[PDB]
Amino acid sequence: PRLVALVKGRVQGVGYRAFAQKKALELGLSGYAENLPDGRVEVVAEGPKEALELFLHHLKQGPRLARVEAVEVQWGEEAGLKGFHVY
């Protein structure tokens, strides 16, 4: 399946995207983590539900300087993303 997450809090300037990329690739997930102009981060990942939930657990924590307020999520269908890209 596809996970679409909107990450809110103190999540830019804290190495969050590369953190998400590493956790995604360790789980064989594909997708992306993109910085938004308001300070939030859009994260999309595709793969098995169990792997996506573990990944989502990581997104809710972030690296040690991050302060994740909330991760709003929706579940959808895989489009065929491959590899994990930051932007």
Distance between CA atoms of 73 and 43, rounded to whole angstroms? Answer: 9
- The total domain count for the chain is 1
Counting beta carbons within 10 angstroms of the beta carbon of residue 14, is it exposed (0 to 12), middle (13 to 18) or buried (19 or more)?
middle
Q: Where are the beta strands (DSSP E) in the chain?
A: 2-10, 30-35, 41-46, 67-76, 84-86
- What distance, in Å, lies between the first and last C-alpha atoms of the chain? 22
The CATH number of whichever domain residue 37 belongs to comes to 3.30.70.100
Q: Which residues are catalytic?
A: 17, 35
Q: Residue 24's closest CA among 69, 86, 77? A: 86
Task: Tell me phi and psi for residue 11, to 5 degrees.
Answer: -130, 0
Q: What domain range is 8 assigned to?
A: 1-87
Collapsed DSSP state (helix, strand, coil) of residue 87: coil
Paired residues of 71 in beta bridges: 7
User: Tokens standing for 61?
Assistant: 């924590």
